[PDB]
């Protein structure tokens, strides 16, 4: 079988230990009082450290991958509690914070009968066998012509283990549980077997102790199951570990934007240079353990359209820090910023651009190299390039009038029939170009202000009663011009008798191009035919 986007990244299951021992203090003091007698420096529970680290991992992932990368968050005490599901709807950090608040901190003075991390480890193996929405969609599209969609997942377990012996018992329990449950998923239609599972066992312990658990490198326990074991102090070390792990599980790289000139608005000497670090998919650095890109101060006379070979969502490492929050909101407020790849070459290299789009910040990969399209041929030396009288500004109005706009539904009714927006756009371009001379000297009527009220509505598929009146009024005015013998613009870019015959013939050409649109169109032509001068 194959994995596409259905690798292990697709399904990640957290299993955090909520047994009474997790209420113990990480013993890393925190100074919540900066500047009499400051308050007692407090400390977080091992539980709190684990929920912090795992939520920050989930934040970074959710920013870089708002779709198709899913998480089930399970807490384990006397039983398992899965705080969300696989649906993309349920991939919401806020609802998770509420669930976590409702399980609460572990009770130190409780004796929950039969409590252990094993409850949630089973639950992890069980939910890995439930189909996601994207999995269910791919099975239903690949038919029995495949239904070899891969089903692989990852289980991240934060706990307080007893010993190396104890940790190995957990691996073996997962190993047997995957083996037995896969048999059920086999003779189950609503469940998929686990084709590969990666198990990450994170033992965390208070600062000042020596862990009873030692790191164990990745080991193949099963054709399905691989497993590894980390020992790491709670607090900032546990946090650093899950930051390293999120980058490895999702193929992320780090970029620090350097030399951002910042300052405090309510100060003077506040001018200073700052550095902000972002995470994004590693593909952003392919053209090129942190990559530095130097801030380039924005020139308001910059290029509006950049050649971009890729665009990658970012998540700031320190999202609430003052300098990152500065960079972020600058981008969010509409500004873009170009980034330079440092080189002692001398020739400055603009390799990237940061730009927000509707509130989501992408890192754009630019072209640093010479362009194979450099020095194109001159318009004047090619076909039609010796023509001096292109209706450029008239055609630009055509473009403005045929700008596209997003519609909410896949289709919308027109005449009791459902139409595709982009199809209707394409159909309008057809009507607007049935008669559209490209150069000034090839038209009389499109050089005439008096014809606009007619020419601008006759191309519509139906005419309002007001549209009809303005069409007749245009025709009536042309009769007045011919009677006054007003000069017409057919000039170089003969006899006035001929001028009007030509002008009327062209107006008739335009109208006849549209008489099949509607019966009102037909009547506009009857009016033209009756009011014009005939040879």
């Amino acid at each position: 079988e194959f994995m596409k986007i259905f690798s292990e990244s697709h399904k990640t299951v957290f299993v955090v230990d909520h047994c009474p021992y997790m209420a113990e203090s990480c013993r890393q003091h925190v100074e919540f009082d900066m500047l009499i007698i400051p308050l007692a420096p407090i400390s977080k529970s091992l539980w709190t450290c684990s929920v912090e680290s795992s939520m920050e991992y989930c934040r970074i992932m959710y920013d870089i991958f708002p779709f198709k990368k899913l998480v089930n968050f399970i807490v384990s005490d006397s039983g398992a509690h899965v705080l969300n599901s696989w649906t993309q709807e349920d991939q919401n950090l806020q609802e998770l914070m509420a669930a976590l608040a409702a399980v609460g901190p572990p009770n130190p003075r409780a004796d929950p009968e039969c409590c252990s991390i094993l409850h949630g480890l089973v639950a992890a193996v069980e939910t890995l066998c439930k189909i996601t929405e994207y999995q269910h969609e791919a099975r239903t599209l690949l038919m029995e012509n495949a239904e070899r969609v891969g089903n692989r997942g990852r289980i991240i377990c934060i706990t307080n283990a007893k010993s190396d012996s104890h940790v190995r018992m957990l691996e073996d329990c997962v190993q047997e549980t995957i083996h037995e449950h896969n048999k059920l998923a086999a003779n189950s239609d609503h469940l998929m077997q686990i084709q590969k599972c990666e198990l990450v066992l994170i033992h965390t312990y208070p600062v000042g102790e020596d862990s009873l658990v030692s790191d164990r490198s990745k080991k193949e326990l099963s054709p399905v199951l691989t497993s590894e074991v980390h020992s790491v102090r709670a607090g900032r070390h546990l946090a650093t570990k899950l930051n390293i792990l999120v980058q490895q599980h999702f193929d992320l790289a780090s970029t620090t934007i350097t030399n951002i000139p910042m300052k405090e608005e309510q100060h003077a000497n506040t001018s200073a240079n700052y550095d902000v670090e972002l995470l994004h998919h590693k593909d952003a650095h392919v053209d090129f353990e942190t990559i530095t890109l130097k801030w380039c101060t924005p020139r308001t006379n910059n290029i509006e359209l950049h050649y971009c070979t890729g665009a990658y969502r970012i998540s700031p490492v320190d999202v609430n820090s003052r300098p990152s929050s500065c960079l972020t909101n600058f981008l969010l407020n509409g500004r873009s910023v170009l980034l330079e790849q440092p080189r002692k070459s001398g020739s400055k290299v603009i390799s990237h651009m940061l730009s927000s789009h509707g509130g989501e910040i992408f890192l754009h990969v630019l072209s640093s190299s010479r362009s194979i399209l450099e020095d194109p041929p001159s318009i004047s030396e090619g076909c039609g390039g010796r023509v001096t009288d292109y209706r450029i500004t008239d055609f630009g109005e055509f473009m403005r009038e045929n700008r596209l706009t997003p519609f909410l539904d896949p289709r919308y009714k027109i005449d009791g029939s459902l139409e595709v927006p982009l199809e209707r756009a394409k159909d309008q371009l057809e009507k607007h170009t049935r008669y559209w001379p490209m150069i000034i000297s090839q038209t009389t009527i499109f050089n005439m202000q008096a014809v606009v009220p007619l020419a601008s509505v006759i191309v519509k598929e139906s005419l309002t009663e007001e549209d009809v009146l303005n069409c007749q009024k245009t025709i009536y005015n042309l009769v007045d011009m011919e009677r006054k013998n007003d000069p017409l613009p057919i000039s170089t870019v003969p006899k006035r008798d001929e001028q009007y015959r030509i002008m009327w013939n062209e107006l008739e050409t335009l109208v006849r191009a549209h008489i099949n649109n509607s019966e009102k169109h037909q009547r506009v032509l009857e009016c033209l035919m009756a009011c014009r001068s005939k040879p």
């Binding site: 500004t393 519609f407 371009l429």
Partner: protein
């Protein structure tokens, strides 16, 4: 681009015919084949850059990437007596040469002309590549010395990307011409299309010829080529397209065709120059209006036409292809749901053309666009603390933000199970109430102690304000009558 790698070793001075059927040495038919290639390029593929590398004991770049096929042509007569200096594999030289100019994302074709005579290895090339080997020895000769299997290995090492060309017959001029002719047809025939905007049309070439795209060798393995009818479907302002990521960029250029499909001389582009052409109209308007034209490449595949955006370079009409699929650019939404303004209820762009329907925004806010609580770094805790205190002093003017900041810290502390923090803040607040100055609005002390008391009750966990939804409200007091270093950072646009 193209790099011609030309063998100038001694073996290439052997006669093509020991029977004297023709007078040429191998190097002479090689130059005849290249002359044919350069002449084709010069008239049917003019925009292509070509470099010329020569090699024997050493190698040298003789002609750097150029579109001047005359200098390339003139180089052939003078290449045996050109000084070679470099001492790696010429194929190492090709790698350095290609990436030093174009980077490593541009498809280059490497044309190796030789008779075959028998750290990171250069193959497969680090860029998208074809290796075409033009054998100046016939098949029977190549087979008779196992040289044919070596050359065939090079294609294998370049993952079959490329081809060996051989003559099974007399190594004469007609056969070498036939051979380079086959290379031309395979690798240098222009891509011709029709550019359409409704009834406005122009016959065009798309340069370079776009490479056939494969999405997912499992989920969708069929290579995609762009439709030859390039249908414009609508226009979008440059500010709304906002520098989208694209697969590749192309010049789109008009071509003069005949009844026979014949691209038509010192007098032909004269009469072609006086015939109005939709490419010029479209290009000029696009530049003046600052727009792009969205173009359909095939079912669920779109791209854009636009003019050169740097105003100091020559401009001409260009096309970029988007990634295939129904929604390549999130901020535009699904291409098929882009429609005409005439069908919208109100005009999305504003009565005074001062609005835009773009960008669409994602259904859910990212974390930097939305308040999030992050307390892993002790700085991040202190800043949320000093935020609550700064507003606690400014009461009752800022009770709103005071109680917004306060309830945020309450909710996050309950989510994380960090109940000690609730008691700790509650204690800071009641110190503030103690330390208040005697000029303080009287409401400040009532709010500070009510906040500090409600915050300690949430430490209790004993289903008081301990509930996640239960926010701390200000007291409704009836008083009837009258940032320094810890503020926001801004972007210093000076220096």
């Amino acid at each position: 681009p193209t790099v011609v790698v030309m063998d100038v070793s001694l073996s290439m001075t052997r006669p093509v015919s020991i029977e004297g059927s023709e007078e040429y040495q191998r190097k002479h038919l090689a130059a005849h084949g290249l002359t044919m290639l350069f002449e084709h390029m010069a008239t049917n593929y003019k925009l292509e850059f070509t470099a010329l590398v020569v090699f024997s004991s050493l190698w040298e770049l003789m002609v750097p990437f150029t579109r001047d096929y005359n200098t390339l042509q003139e180089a052939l007569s003078n290449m045996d007596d050109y000084d070679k200096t470099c001492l790696e594999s010429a194929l190492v030289g090709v790698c350095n040469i290609v990436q030093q100019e174009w980077g490593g994302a541009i498809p280059c074709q490497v044309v190796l002309v030789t008779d075959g005579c028998l750290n990171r290895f250069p193959l497969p090339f680090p860029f998208p590549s074809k290796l075409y080997i033009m054998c100046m020895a016939n098949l029977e000769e190549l087979q008779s010395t196992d040289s044919l299997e070596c050359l065939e290995r090079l294609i294998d090492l370049n993952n079959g990307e490329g081809q060996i060309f051989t003559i099974d017959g007399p190594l004469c001029l007609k056969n070498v011409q036939s051979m380079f002719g086959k290379l031309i047809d395979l690798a240098y025939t222009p891509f011709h299309a029709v550019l359409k905007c409704g009834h406005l049309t122009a016959d065009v070439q798309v340069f370079p010829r776009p490479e056939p795209f494969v999405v997912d060798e499992e989920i969708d393995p069929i290579p995609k080529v762009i439709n030859t009818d390039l249908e414009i479907v609508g226009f979008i302002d440059i500010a709304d397209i906002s520098s989208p990521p694209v697969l590749s960029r192309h010049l789109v250029l008009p071509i003069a065709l005949n009844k026979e499909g014949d691209e038509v001389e010192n007098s032909a582009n004269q009469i072609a120059g006086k015939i109005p052409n939709f490419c010029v109209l479209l290009h000029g308007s696009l530049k003046v209006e600052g727009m792009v034209a969205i173009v359909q490449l095939g079912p669920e595949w779109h791209g854009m036409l636009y003019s050169q955006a740097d105003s100091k370079k020559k401009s001409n009409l260009m096309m970029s292809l988007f990634e295939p699929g129904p929604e390549p650019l999130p901020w535009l939404g699904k291409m098929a749901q882009l429609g005409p303004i005439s069908d919208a209820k109100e005009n999305p762009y504003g009565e005074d053309d001062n609005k835009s329907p773009f960008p669409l925004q994602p259904k859910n806010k990212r974390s930097y666009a939305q308040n999030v609580t992050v307390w892993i770094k002790p700085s991040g805790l202190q800043t949320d603390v000093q935020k609550i205190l700064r507003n606690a002093r400014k009461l009752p003017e800022k009770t709103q933000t005071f109680y917004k900041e306060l309830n945020r810290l309450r909710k996050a502390a309950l989510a994380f199970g960090f109940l000690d923090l609730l008691k700790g803040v509650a204690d800071m607040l009641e110190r503030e109430c103690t330390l208040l100055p005697e000029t303080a609005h009287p409401d400040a002390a009532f709010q500070l102690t009510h906040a500090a008391q409600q915050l300690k009750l949430a430490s209790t966990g004993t289903s008081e304000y301990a509930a996640y939804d239960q926010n701390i409200t200000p007291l409704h007091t009836d008083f009837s009558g009258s940032d320094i270093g810890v503020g926001n950072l801004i972007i210093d646009l000076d220096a």
